[PDB]
Scaffold this motif. Structure first.
Motif, PDB file in Angstrom:
ATOM      1  N   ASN A 105       0.846  -1.161   0.000  1.00 28.44           N
ATOM      2  CA  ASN A 105       0.000   0.000   0.000  1.00 28.44           C
ATOM      3  C   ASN A 105       0.893   1.225   0.000  1.00 28.44           C
ATOM      4  N   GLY A 106       0.439   2.294  -0.635  1.00 30.68           N
ATOM      5  CA  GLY A 106       1.225   3.518  -0.685  1.00 30.68           C
ATOM      6  C   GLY A 106       2.069   3.454  -1.942  1.00 30.68           C
ATOM      7  N   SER A 107       2.640   4.577  -2.349  1.00 33.53           N
ATOM      8  CA  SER A 107       3.446   4.583  -3.556  1.00 33.53           C
ATOM      9  C   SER A 107       4.889   4.264  -3.254  1.00 33.53           C
ATOM     10  N   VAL A 108       5.479   3.432  -4.086  1.00 38.47           N
ATOM     11  CA  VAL A 108       6.883   3.099  -3.985  1.00 38.47           C
ATOM     12  C   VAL A 108       7.674   4.140  -4.735  1.00 38.47           C
ATOM     13  N   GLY A 109       8.725   4.637  -4.116  1.00 39.66           N
ATOM     14  CA  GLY A 109       9.586   5.627  -4.732  1.00 39.66           C
ATOM     15  C   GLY A 109      10.607   6.086  -3.721  1.00 39.66           C
ATOM     16  N   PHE A 110      11.535   6.913  -4.149  1.00 41.71           N
ATOM     17  CA  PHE A 110      12.521   7.366  -3.202  1.00 41.71           C
ATOM     18  C   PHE A 110      11.856   8.307  -2.244  1.00 41.71           C
ATOM     19  N   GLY A 111      12.165   8.121  -0.988  1.00 43.03           N
ATOM     20  CA  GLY A 111      11.672   8.960   0.087  1.00 43.03           C
ATOM     21  C   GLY A 111      10.253   8.644   0.513  1.00 43.03           C
ATOM     22  N   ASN A 112       9.626   7.667  -0.118  1.00 41.92           N
ATOM     23  CA  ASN A 112       8.257   7.367   0.214  1.00 41.92           C
ATOM     24  C   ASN A 112       8.145   6.325   1.292  1.00 41.92           C
ATOM     25  N   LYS A 113       7.008   6.331   1.969  1.00 41.54           N
ATOM     26  CA  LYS A 113       6.709   5.323   2.957  1.00 41.54           C
ATOM     27  C   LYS A 113       5.600   4.470   2.435  1.00 41.54           C
ATOM     28  N   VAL A 114       5.795   3.180   2.555  1.00 38.08           N
ATOM     29  CA  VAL A 114       4.827   2.212   2.094  1.00 38.08           C
ATOM     30  C   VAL A 114       4.581   1.201   3.179  1.00 38.08           C
ATOM     31  N   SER A 115       3.543   0.408   3.046  1.00 40.55           N
ATOM     32  CA  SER A 115       3.307  -0.602   4.064  1.00 40.55           C
ATOM     33  C   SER A 115       2.587  -1.812   3.540  1.00 40.55           C
ATOM     34  N   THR A 116       2.645  -2.892   4.294  1.00 39.47           N
ATOM     35  CA  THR A 116       1.901  -4.059   3.872  1.00 39.47           C
ATOM     36  C   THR A 116       1.346  -4.793   5.059  1.00 39.47           C
ATOM     37  N   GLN A 117       0.226  -5.439   4.842  1.00 36.02           N
ATOM     38  CA  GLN A 117      -0.400  -6.270   5.836  1.00 36.02           C
ATOM     39  C   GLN A 117      -0.086  -7.663   5.438  1.00 36.02           C
ATOM     40  N   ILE A 118       0.394  -8.464   6.357  1.00 39.02           N
ATOM     41  CA  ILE A 118       0.743  -9.788   5.932  1.00 39.02           C
ATOM     42  C   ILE A 118      -0.517 -10.617   5.836  1.00 39.02           C
ATOM     43  N   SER A 119      -0.760 -11.166   4.658  1.00 32.82           N
ATOM     44  CA  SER A 119      -1.944 -11.958   4.388  1.00 32.82           C
ATOM     45  C   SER A 119      -1.970 -13.216   5.229  1.00 32.82           C
ATOM     46  N   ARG A 120      -3.153 -13.644   5.645  1.00 36.60           N
ATOM     47  CA  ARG A 120      -3.262 -14.867   6.430  1.00 36.60           C
ATOM     48  C   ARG A 120      -3.361 -16.068   5.513  1.00 36.60           C
ATOM     49  N   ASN A 121      -2.284 -16.349   4.808  1.00 31.60           N
ATOM     50  CA  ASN A 121      -2.303 -17.448   3.853  1.00 31.60           C
ATOM     51  C   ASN A 121      -1.880 -18.763   4.456  1.00 31.60           C
ATOM     52  N   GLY A 122      -0.930 -18.709   5.357  1.00 28.62           N
ATOM     53  CA  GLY A 122      -0.415 -19.892   6.016  1.00 28.62           C
ATOM     54  C   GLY A 122      -0.744 -19.733   7.466  1.00 28.62           C
ATOM     55  N   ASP A 123      -0.158 -20.560   8.314  1.00 28.49           N
ATOM     56  CA  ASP A 123      -0.471 -20.478   9.714  1.00 28.49           C
ATOM     57  C   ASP A 123       0.634 -19.742  10.457  1.00 28.49           C
ATOM     58  N   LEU A 124       1.879 -20.061  10.116  1.00 22.90           N
ATOM     59  CA  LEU A 124       2.998 -19.408  10.788  1.00 22.90           C
ATOM     60  C   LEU A 124       3.839 -18.711   9.713  1.00 22.90           C
ATOM     61  N   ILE A 125       4.575 -17.650  10.042  1.00 27.88           N
ATOM     62  CA  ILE A 125       5.502 -17.085   9.037  1.00 27.88           C
ATOM     63  C   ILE A 125       6.927 -16.999   9.541  1.00 27.88           C
ATOM     64  N   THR A 126       7.893 -17.054   8.620  1.00 31.74           N
ATOM     65  CA  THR A 126       9.280 -16.913   9.038  1.00 31.74           C
ATOM     66  C   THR A 126       9.979 -15.796   8.322  1.00 31.74           C
ATOM     67  N   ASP A 127      10.738 -16.147   7.316  1.00 33.36           N
ATOM     68  CA  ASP A 127      11.505 -15.162   6.605  1.00 33.36           C
ATOM     69  C   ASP A 127      10.648 -14.227   5.815  1.00 33.36           C
ATOM     70  N   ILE A 128      11.115 -12.998   5.749  1.00 27.61           N
ATOM     71  CA  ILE A 128      10.518 -11.968   4.950  1.00 27.61           C
ATOM     72  C   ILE A 128      11.625 -11.350   4.144  1.00 27.61           C
ATOM     73  N   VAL A 129      11.428 -11.277   2.849  1.00 32.85           N
ATOM     74  CA  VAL A 129      12.426 -10.711   1.974  1.00 32.85           C
ATOM     75  C   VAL A 129      11.828  -9.598   1.170  1.00 32.85           C
ATOM     76  N   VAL A 130      12.460  -8.445   1.200  1.00 35.02           N
ATOM     77  CA  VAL A 130      11.933  -7.358   0.416  1.00 35.02           C
ATOM     78  C   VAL A 130      12.740  -7.269  -0.860  1.00 35.02           C
ATOM     79  N   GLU A 131      12.066  -7.347  -1.986  1.00 34.44           N
ATOM     80  CA  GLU A 131      12.749  -7.286  -3.247  1.00 34.44           C
ATOM     81  C   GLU A 131      12.748  -5.864  -3.719  1.00 34.44           C
ATOM     82  N   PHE A 132      13.880  -5.386  -4.240  1.00 32.37           N
ATOM     83  CA  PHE A 132      13.913  -3.991  -4.757  1.00 32.37           C
ATOM     84  C   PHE A 132      14.661  -3.940  -6.095  1.00 32.37           C
TER      85      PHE A 132
END
Lengths: 94, 107, 432, 436, 435
Positions: free
Chosen positions: C44-71
């Motif tokens: 959510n929010g616009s991706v760009g330099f100086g911008n703030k964005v966010s995400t809600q982690i979807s309830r797809n699985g039961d537990l989560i571990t690693d998170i990798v942000v691709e850029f």
């Protein structure tokens, strides 16, 4: 042809060049009346338990060999009270 | 059950050629844990062997080179090995329609 | 091997009599019936330099571990003009559960963390996922992967999204307004620079019926880690003296360790003075060398001569918690003992834990019971002429480069424990 | 200190050697033995002695038991040193032992040579040669007395002394055949030697005189003597050829428990020649020089250990068509068999295969009973005769499977077998229990 | 295969393997009384030198003794070819005495005769290696020689002397060193200026028994059959170049004799039992212009060439009646050894055995001369008409003749080896039959 000697189990012992005639020649005879601590042959009974392994505890500890402190920790002989005759390891050959 | 007895002529009940004219269809030796034949096996093992009273742990007499082979009967007992590898979980999905679970076959 | 087996004596009884284990036969303790899936999150929010964005982690699985942000970043200059630019780009990340802040990482923290805790090929591979390491040229495009470093990101741990049916788990990511060698070169903007593309990926665990039910219904108390961070002004080092400083540390909670660095805000990752020795400045070692700009691709160094800490001690409730030690103790010995990797010059660590790199607590300092925690620093004398290699390399213990006075920012971190209580679909931290 | 310090070091490993010690080495008890005396008595030879003649003698009952028998011959050299080879051995063409009209055994000059090649050794072999040949470079006209021992079972051990005493009604006779020619004595190859002397012959029997009690028991008790016999079959050799590896399957018409087989290939022209001739030192007359001839041996050096001049590539023995043992090279039979079973050195061209652990001794130690083998066969493969015998480079630098072109002259094969039978003596008469 | 032989079983096999009694594939070794052996140097009294007599008492160090080795150090007074078993020559004689009782006595010539007759093959060679120079050594060479003694207790453990049982009787060995040794201090009759005197040492191999045996040997009486050497030296009827000289030699022998042995020799040249001749090895310089038939090739003194032996024929007569038919000297030289020993005997050395196996320890037939009032050895010599300097004559001659140089072999040595009884008890001992 030593049909009259000390059979250990199935073997006749030799200590000072001559075959052990009776139990009175063995060193264990000097402490045969004391409940010894350990018996030197140490026959293991029924196999030893396996080495349980896991990928959770080893990865969480990151090494650090966390040793448990709630074990039995079999004591030694206090310096003041000599050494109990029980501390002499019985070498029950037979 | 019918646990064989290590004798003075066959101290380890290994059944090399020891089944000739006496129990050709020999039963298994012993489990070595249940029915403690270990003490009598070592007692049969010596029958005139002279230890030096310096080898207190009973290892200099090459006892590590003496053991019981995994097959002590006249047969290799392939039915036990076969029932050990497969044969378990009787009545498969292909035959009777109650043991299948929406996935494929076992592996 | 029979000749070794016969060599058995009384000394061996302690090792092999009445044996408890065998090395030749193993059994496993843990079983799974679990699956792992990589799923893209919506940003959510616009991706760009100086911008703030966010995400809600979807309830797809039961537990989560690693998170990798691709850029996806592009080079605004040639090889050697960037330094961990994907790390620099991700200015910070907040972790929030139920609206409660759980934790927060900073680009500098990722750099400090890496400096202390990653190592060997692991470290190189990390660099491969955040920078250009094969002399790529201007215009090159690359997909970077920045793994996150929160309390749930070792395979034995995971965050129970399934146990949080009424609370959302969110990540708030701040993208830097400027990234060296991508959209800026020192203070200058790079005309035509591309805006970044971002994607957030979460690796999900799918549990079997019994494991899933327990997480979903039972109360839990998860021992978690948090990062505390206080930025401050550095007593400025000087050619004329040994600057000194007492920094009050507003820290709390059982702390595994404290870490800090001194830096030049202009250049990401610069924890040391610049100098005309190869790698220590742009063009270093030759006629074109400038000791006012780093060789960005070689910003980090192990040459302590360019660091500014002479010595330090940490005072707790007015007491000295240890004897004063040299900066090299904190830079080299501490991580030798506590981590086993190699820490670059300008980065310091003091551990309260036997092994801070693990998850299992191994000794902590509880700052919630400390009213007066102070970091006492002594700086090196900035008298060495950075443009003269002989001065730079043939000097003493208590001195550094004249260019070392540029490292005016001080970053002090503390990594601690807290308790994340989860029950009846909701959760949060027991202590704050 | 000293020897006592070794005695100190006693443990379990010694029990097996000295515990409950049985015997000692330092107290020999000699056994008391029956009293006797040994006398050498000359027997009368009937028939004319001469080359090619047959003569015989009856052993009179001068003593009670007999053992050793030595036949003396007096010969004069028909040429110089290098011209003779065991000439007294050659001269005694054969000897036949008969008791009460039953043939017990029979030996041949070639057998004596084969036997010697396999079973005598070291100084025994040398001394033997001294008693049958001229070995100190004697010259033409030199006269020497030769002593040829017989090797019948009773001529080898006292244990089998023949009980003439218990053979009161059966005569014991020895029939002898003297060779028509003896090399270097009355003939040089095929050429007669003018003026050669006829031999003087004498048969000496060594008699045992027993004391009263032993004598009486022998005279009246039945006896069972385990004795040896020599079987022999002479035959043509598949002639070796420069073009190939000749092969042959020889039915062995042997019987009785056989201790061993022995054989050789030879050139009958020259006594004792079991190998090919060549221009290498000792391998032919004049060998090593321009005058060398690979058509005539250096008689004085007829024998050799150089297997390159032998013809057997390999051999096996089959029993009823089945292989007895794996096929082995000729050098196995020549060198290993006797190494293992005898302990001496066997000359090239002579082969041995034992069925016994100790074939050189008296006590039976494993035998092959051919009386129960319908068809035993000796299977031979010969070497290719492609080597130029006159060229040492070819003679000495060649391969395992080849031999001299002169090896094709070795056309005769002699196969021997030594077996065990029982000589029964009772009520003054006796003979052999097993005819077949 | 081997199985095809096992199945070939029938009536003729019964007498070999039916109802079998023994095997060959299960050897059970006999256990034995434990012991150890040490070679211990004795103290030898008396100046050691040529022509001197020295002696030693064997200490009672172990319990039993066997082998005795006399060491000597000799040097070469000339080049290779000048010596012949010089350490053997040096030890002129050895006398064995127990408690003042002579047990036996050997002579250098006996050692040579004994060797010539009873050792063989590599044993004989190895023996020569311990008593002579056999690797073409040159003047000035120095070697330690080892001369084993050959007394009955020195040949088998079975006859070890129970020194432990001899508390009151000493065992002594008296040794005489020759006044001259060829190629060492003399060359023929000529002394070698500067020749060194020998160094001597006597080593006795002692047997140390374990406890029970030491006790029994110390306390029980013992009895051993022992061997003794009787020896009578005499003049040989001088062999003649004109006829066949003969001689009847009354043999003053006693006791059950295992065998007789004898040789003829030139007393000047140790070990020379044959005539000299100009044929290779038969004389100094033989085969060339410089050859002489007055001096032997000392290094090659012995030979197997019968033409150089002196004896034509011989017999032993007992109380006037022939004991066996007259046989040629060559019969006593080659056949007796074939039959009784199995080795090869050098020309000039003769054997007549009364024993089936005279080379062994176990008696196997003896001639008791103590019950033969008059035993005589009758010898006939060859005619010594052959010109020793001419190989054609030396090598092409007849059975009844020998070299003119055979007349130099005028010394005759007749030996008899017999059985006596050694009894030891209560710390003392000696022999049942005196001489």
């Amino acid at each position: 042809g030593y049909e009259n000697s000390y059979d250990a189990n199935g073997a006749r012992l030799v200590m000072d060049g001559k075959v052990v005639k009776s139990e009175c020649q063995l060193p264990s005879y000097q402490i045969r009346n004391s409940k010894h601590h350990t018996q030197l042959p140490m026959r293991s009974l029924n196999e030893p338990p396996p080495m349980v392994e896991d990928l959770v505890d080893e990865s969480l500890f990151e090494g650090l060999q966390g040793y448990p402190v709630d074990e039995k920790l079999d004591l030694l002989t206090p310096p003041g009270t000599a050494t109990p005759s029980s501390e002499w390891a019985a070498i029950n050959y037979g | 059950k019918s646990c064989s007895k290590s004798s003075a002529n066959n101290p380890f009940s290994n059944a090399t050629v020891g089944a000739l004219l006496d129990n050709e269809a020999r039963p298994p030796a012993c489990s070595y844990d249940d029915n403690d034949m270990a003490s009598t096996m070592r007692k049969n093992f010596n029958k005139g062997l002279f230890r030096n009273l310096d080898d207190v742990y009973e290892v200099e007499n090459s006892q590590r080179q003496f053991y019981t082979m995994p097959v002590t009967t006249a047969a290799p007992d392939l039915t036990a090995f076969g029932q050990f590898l497969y044969g378990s979980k009787g009545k498969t999905c292909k035959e009777d329609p109650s043991a299948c679970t929406p996935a494929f076959a076992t592996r | 091997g029979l000749s070794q087996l016969v060599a058995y004596g009384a000394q061996d009884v302690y090792l092999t009599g009445n044996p408890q284990i065998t090395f030749f036969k193993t059994v496993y303790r843990r079983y799974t019936n679990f699956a792992i899936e990589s799923i893209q999150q919506t940003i959510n929010g616009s991706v760009g330099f100086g911008n703030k964005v966010s995400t809600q982690i979807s309830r797809n699985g039961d537990l989560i571990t690693d998170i990798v942000v691709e850029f996806v970043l592009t080079k605004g200059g040639n090889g050697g003009t960037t330094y961990y630019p994907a790390e620099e780009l991700l200015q910070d990340v907040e972790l929030e559960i139920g609206g409660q802040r759980i934790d927060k990482h900073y680009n500098d923290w990722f750099r400090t963390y890496d400096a202390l805790f990653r190592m060997n090929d692991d470290r190189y591979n990390y660099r491969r996922m955040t920078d250009w390491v094969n002399n790529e040229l201007v215009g090159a495009q690359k997909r970077f992967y920045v793994p996150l470093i929160f309390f749930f990101n070792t395979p034995g741990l995971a965050l129970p999204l399934i146990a949080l049916q009424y609370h959302e788990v969110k990540l708030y990511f701040t993208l830097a307004s400027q990234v060296q060698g991508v959209n800026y070169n020192g203070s200058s903007a790079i005309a035509g620079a591309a805006q970044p593309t971002m994607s957030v990926w979460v690796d999900y665990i799918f549990l079997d019926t019994q494991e899933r039910t327990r997480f979903a219904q039972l109360p839990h108390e998860y021992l978690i880690e948090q990062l505390q961070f206080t930025g401050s002004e550095t007593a400025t080092p000087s050619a004329t003296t040994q600057a000194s400083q007492n920094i009050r540390l507003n820290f709390n909670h059982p702390t595994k360790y404290l870490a800090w660095n001194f830096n030049n805000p202009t250049n990401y990752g610069q924890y040391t003075a610049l100098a005309n020795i190869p790698g220590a400045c742009s063009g270093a070692g030759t006629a074109a060398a400038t000791v006012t700009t780093p060789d960005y691709g070689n910003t980090g160094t192990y040459n302590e001569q360019l660091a500014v800490l002479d010595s330090a001690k940490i005072q707790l409730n007015g007491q000295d918690r240890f004897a004063t030690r040299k900066g090299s103790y904190f830079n080299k010995v501490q991580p030798y003992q506590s981590i086993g990797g190699v820490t670059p010059a300008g980065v310091y660590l003091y551990s309260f834990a036997l092994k801070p790199a693990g998850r299992q607590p191994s000794g902590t300092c509880n700052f919630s019971r400390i009213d007066n925690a102070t970091l006492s620093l002594t700086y090196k004398t900035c008298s060495i002429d950075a443009t003269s290699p002989a001065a730079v390399l043939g000097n003493t213990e208590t001195v550094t480069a004249n260019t070392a006075t540029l490292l005016t920012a001080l970053n002090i971190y503390a990594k601690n424990y807290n308790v994340l209580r989860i029950m009846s679909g909701m959760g949060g931290l027991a202590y704050a």
